[PDB]
Amino acid sequence: WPWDSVRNNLRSALTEMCVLYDVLSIVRSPQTLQLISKKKSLAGAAQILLKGAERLTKSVAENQENKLQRDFNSELLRLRQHWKLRKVGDKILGDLSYRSAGSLFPHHGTFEVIKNTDIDLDKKIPLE
């Protein structure tokens, strides 16, 4: 909705400029509107907070109820604690090159998580 929002902003700016120019040229019952407005504002704030809570605590509660397929906080620490330590060239942490006692030749590790639409899929980090 790039063009739609652009046109809306343009119309709003045109209206604002017209009102400002007009002001410059001119310069030289049981209604309870406040109560209804406050009620509508409270309803809107409650709807926004409910949408936020649904986005946060309902779509991220997968591993909270039962450990399922999720690379987030369930896969990376596994392989970390099991094989190597953390390091940051860019995202390269503990490549397996026997550098502890090799002393022959160095080799780095291009290890990085990736996404794919499937069931039970890990990060699958990349001689070969």
């Binding site: 406040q34 407005s37 704030a45 926004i48 946060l56």
Partner: peptide, 24 residues
Amino acid sequence: GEQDNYEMHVRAANIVRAGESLMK
């Protein structure tokens, strides 16, 4: 005066959006 709360999109809902997003 009546639109003091009817403009919540630019007054109230304009800060709540980013304010309820930075946490997670």
